Amino acid sequence: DPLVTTNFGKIRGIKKELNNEILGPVIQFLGVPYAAPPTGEHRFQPPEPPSPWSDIRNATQFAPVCPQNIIDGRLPEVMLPVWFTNNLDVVSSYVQDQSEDCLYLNIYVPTEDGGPKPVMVYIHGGSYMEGTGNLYDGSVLASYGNVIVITVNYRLGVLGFLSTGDQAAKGNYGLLDLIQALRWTSENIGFFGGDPLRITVFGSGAGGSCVNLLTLSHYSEGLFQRAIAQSGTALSSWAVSFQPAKYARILATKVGCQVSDTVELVECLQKKPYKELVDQDVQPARYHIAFGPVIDGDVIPDDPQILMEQGEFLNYDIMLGVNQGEGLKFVENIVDSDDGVSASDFDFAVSNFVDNLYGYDVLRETIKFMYTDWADRHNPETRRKTLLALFTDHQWVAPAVATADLHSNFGSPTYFYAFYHHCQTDQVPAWADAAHGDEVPYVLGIPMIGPTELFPCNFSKNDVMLSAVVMTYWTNFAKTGDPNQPVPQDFEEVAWTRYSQKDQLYLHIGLKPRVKEHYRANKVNLWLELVPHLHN
Amino acid sequence: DPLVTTNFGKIRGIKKELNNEILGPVIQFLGVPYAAPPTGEHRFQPPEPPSPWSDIRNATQFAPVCPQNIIDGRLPEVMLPVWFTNNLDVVSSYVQDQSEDCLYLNIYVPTEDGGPKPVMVYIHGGSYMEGTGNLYDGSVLASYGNVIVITVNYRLGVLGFLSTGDQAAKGNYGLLDLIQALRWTSENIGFFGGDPLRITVFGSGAGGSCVNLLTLSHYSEGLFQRAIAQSGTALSSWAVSFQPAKYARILATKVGCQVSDTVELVECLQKKPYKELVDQDVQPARYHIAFGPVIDGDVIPDDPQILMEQGEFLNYDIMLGVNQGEGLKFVENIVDSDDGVSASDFDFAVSNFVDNLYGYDVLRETIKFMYTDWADRHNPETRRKTLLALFTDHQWVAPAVATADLHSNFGSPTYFYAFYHHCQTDQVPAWADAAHGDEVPYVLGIPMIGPTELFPCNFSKNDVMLSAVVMTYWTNFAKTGDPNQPVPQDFEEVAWTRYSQKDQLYLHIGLKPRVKEHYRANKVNLWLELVPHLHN
Amino acid sequence: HSAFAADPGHTTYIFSKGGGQITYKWPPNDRPSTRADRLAIGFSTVQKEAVLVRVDSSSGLGDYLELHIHQGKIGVKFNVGTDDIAIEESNAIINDGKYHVVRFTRSGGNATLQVDSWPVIERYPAGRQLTIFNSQATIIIGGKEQGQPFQGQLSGLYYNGLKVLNMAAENDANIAIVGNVRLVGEV
Amino acid sequence: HSAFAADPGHTTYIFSKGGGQITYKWPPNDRPSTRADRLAIGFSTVQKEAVLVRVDSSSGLGDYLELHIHQGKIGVKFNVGTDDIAIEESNAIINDGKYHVVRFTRSGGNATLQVDSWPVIERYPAGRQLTIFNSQATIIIGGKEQGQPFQGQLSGLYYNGLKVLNMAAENDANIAIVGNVRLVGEV
């Protein structure tokens, strides 16, 4: 039996062998508490260190996840990864078991047959409302790349992000949870053979957002050294909550609280059964979030755009990227069995879109103009392409570029990719490119095993190769802060060149891998340079 | 000895054989007076019919041209045909002989070895200030296509377009001259074998403008039936004079008149020696004209844009088109021996341009954005290309499209071409595409002879073929109002399809002639649909 | 040698029960636009409701001219761009079975209707209107496609110089007779 | 087991006539950015003007830290984004040829300078300033490239945990000694 001693006690893992006879099994420590339960008086408070035990602790099963509601809730289909939206039956099973006491992480440690390994800590996130690290099996990544992989569970939704804009409830509890998790990791991962000076934090979607947010925070100073944000930034409309007080108030009201003083407000919620808080439906503006990270003058000292613009963040090795057709769900339901979009629905889509994002006609006109193919403007297939590209460009591509531009500008080694391949399911239209969340199975090395309940795609032979390529890039980055060094690609002249504002080189990731320049330079500059000139 | 009897007397022509032994010679009647001298009391008055003579009149030499000043004048090089600006030494010779008594036309009649032929009437025009029909030898066109070709002389500049916005001087004299010339033609060309029911009016540059203006005038009713406007519309900034009174005043002032009453203003100018009026330098706004056609609620009943927009014009067969690099002269002198433009000069050019055309920054920014290649925005060669395209698109391509759009919308058979080949001279940079005025030698069938003093280019073998193709299309249009009917192209599937707002089919005229759809639809629609929404 | 001013009759056509239709059509390459129009029609009928002639613009254009009978009173309704304009002889009735000549005249926005020698109806606009009838495509004599077929006789139809019925009695390439229409000759 | 407060010396480098320069260089993939900086340097000189150390940001960035002598008074001048900030010990003089330890301290816009035990000079801002020194590229001990080479001795140079001169006496892969610079040992 595999046992490790931590600063809090002894824990017993479990062995696990993969459905692939080329990969050496791993030992996984599941449900390791990295913090005291955030219950009762510690609700809406920063996390505290875990209590120690004079015992051999069993870390062989997942602990209950943080309270959430994915069925009768709202479920922001545009924000969520497609693989998650498409089978929430299998997702539900990961989340059937919930508890407020939910601050646990999972360790995946490889198996040799010399030297502290890199640690890759995965932060999940759909919309800040739901999810678990448990949905992500770190086994293959750990075994293939010889790195320790940790997946974390942090407070979600109300319990993780309630804020009054005051000292009553300051918010960002879920972010502090991630900091605490990284503290525990930094000072306890050596016992597992991990390297506290080579921790790489990584995440997709709102997970990416967390990653970026953490790099703006002076709390993560000395806790991790590199970051990978996948289809996620701190600059998207749904990255932070700009009106937390308003929604705290609405939530308080909905569960029968005196919304008078903010202290009496929190005190009221402090005491309610979590289910009351979770089962409540608080709808924010279209492409915005109600309960999420907040500008608190502390963890997040100011608007990420300002901080980033001013270089008020430390040096990290950064890797970020986007998928080809991130915004599948924005268009999916507006299509018409002929795989096309009417010139009518288009105007609506774009008009509504600009309304929600920008407000109260030159901009609406400019965007309609910019996203119309004047060669065959009657092609209704083209209309869905450019409509999908509009959402992908706005919500993902332009913020990623801005992020890459600003990190690299201020000296941080930056690598940028664009993901251009996926495994198509029957759950997705055949005309769809790589949707949101589609990089994940490759990164998790799922093709190395073949279809699982979670990712049930029939991974081809090329999917396995791609995954190995991706995993080599990611683990190389984790090892050296360079996706090229150690393990080479056996990609001759195909070396992931570092991104900078001059040529803006990025890696086209697909069955025909290439390194190009200025990804979608026209639209990116539209949104990043020209669209600002049309404001008041 | 060829003689013809006209309603005014008998005239003797002269025979002319071409420097090509495939073309049957022509008889040309030169300096045929189509109206009484517009002198003395008839200055700043509509033209009157010519006096009759009991005599055999010699029409064997060009009459003096209308008074103009092309040397120490301003010479709007952007407006003028490149072939004209590049050798005005040869041009000057055509214009050495001037007189206010200058209302004469020139007839080119073919020679057989049965049925009234079509008549092509050519209206010249650089900036409305200068030129002659004499510059254009109609011989080859007449001989190759079996059509009568007439080239006309009409009053120019002040004498031709002075207006006070009053009844003192109502303006548009040069336009009335063209009407009168077409009256004379309609009732006298039968005597030469011409067909009064098959008159095609055609012109390039400001000539094209005249053509278009005439089709908006109810004076041209029943006088001609088809029109070809080449690099010329009634919608460009320099097509009509919108502040004639202002410039009549400045002119009056400059020659020592009492600018008090408008009647005493015209009286003063009525009496001055024409040289005083011609040698005067009245500079209008950059891309505008001081003395030119005028909205007088008569000949030109209203803003051409309005009239065209409301379909307040009769049915004509229309052919119109543009050249690939019309705006050569806008960029030529801003280039830097490396054939490139600095990002510095660019901003200026575009800023200055938008200032002149639009006034008193979202438009300035949108235009700069739209005309930047965000792929290599540092490529200074590309910078000159798109800068050239900006002027070409604005001053020529957009107006032409708008015109084709509106004529076709209201039922007029419409044919659109884009000219994409030329004969490069040493006088023009080698990177230059077809500039303004470059289609002319092809249409005039100059390659059929080889270099002349006026067009001294070394016409290749392909130039002769193109000319024959162009001339076939033009005369086919003159014959039937369809560039396809009679003489076929020996261009299998290469049939010039009719232009309509649906597909907007146009004929690419090059060595590789093809018909395509929606010429530069991105930039055209930028200027036609989107730029309007950026005005107040 | 034809004139607006002449009686347009005398090529007499019988539009009997079941309906009839005579159609003149201009070639797509020569459909006329006009600033003024001159229509003269000689007819006789007893009907309460019918549509005699209709001139229609090309496709995608709303310009048209319609001459019709409604409640025994002859009238015209046309559109040259702005909106529908109406003019009708209401002072009296014309479906009494005898021969009549109705004249309609258009000058941009101005219009005119006269029934024989009765008082010319004038329809002036209190503001400038569009002046042009854009590319005329067909003349449709009969009013069948409008679901109000005409029943009676037409001796002549003058339109802008065209003697349309006479051209039909000359089997002109552009005339198409369809339905219950006979060209009653003479003797 | 280093401390900013503990004496930074005792690696005694002589910077004699003709000038000298010791330079530490961070790998381009690991140039640090810092919200706070602690510099402590032990030295001795008689010069009226010299530039002892200067930390410079990567290319295309204006962030830097410069420790220098001007008119016998030690001082610092730095920039973290906004503009140049200056702080100097003017109460007295330090070029008397004896050993001194000047400490400089930065907290965002806040700064600190002390010469030995003398009164800590404090330079507070009347408004929030930028707080981060972006990607530190090189430490340039000597001031030669600035055209004011230092002449005298340096027993130690502590910079944000780094014992710069000690690392040079350990032939550390990152240290580059160039010019009139001797590592005077002991005995």
Ligand SMILES: *[C@@H]1O[C@H](CO)[C@@H](O[C@@H]2O[C@H](CO)[C@@H](O)[C@H](O)[C@H]2NC(C)=O)[C@H](O)[C@H]1NC(C)=O
């Ligand atoms: C850890 O889990 C083990 C396995 O379920 C538990 O130990 C069992 O209970 C006692 C404790 O040793 C023994 O009698 C059984 O043999 C154990 N099961 C086996 C075979 O492992 C126990 O609940 C946990 N460990 C403790 C004692 O805290």
Ligand SMILES: *[C@@H]1O[C@H](CO)[C@@H](O[C@@H]2O[C@H](CO)[C@@H](O)[C@H](O)[C@H]2NC(C)=O)[C@H](O)[C@H]1NC(C)=O
């Ligand atoms: C995904 O897997 C299915 C099997 O579940 C593949 O189907 C194969 O062929 C038929 C059709 O379903 C089945 O009876 C076989 O059992 C399947 N073969 C096996 C064992 O894989 C199907 O081709 C795959 N989907 C695609 C086309 O990507």
Ligand SMILES: *[C@@H]1O[C@H](CO)[C@@H](O[C@@H]2O[C@H](CO)[C@@H](O)[C@H](O)[C@H]2NC(C)=O)[C@H](O)[C@H]1NC(C)=O
């Ligand atoms: C027209 O120009 C001709 C060209 O010379 C003139 O003709 C000369 O004069 C008469 C014309 O009637 C002829 O008999 C002579 O032979 C001509 N001279 C020669 C030898 O060239 C004539 O003057 C002009 N036409 C008229 C008569 O007005």
Ligand SMILES: *[C@@H]1O[C@H](CO)[C@@H](O)[C@H](O)[C@H]1NC(C)=O
């Ligand atoms: C072009 O024309 C000139 C005469 O102007 C001639 O001498 C020269 O050789 C020609 N170039 C060629 C050979 O095409």
Ligand SMILES: [Ca+2]
């Ligand atoms: Ca009309």
Ligand SMILES: [Ca+2]
């Ligand atoms: Ca800084």
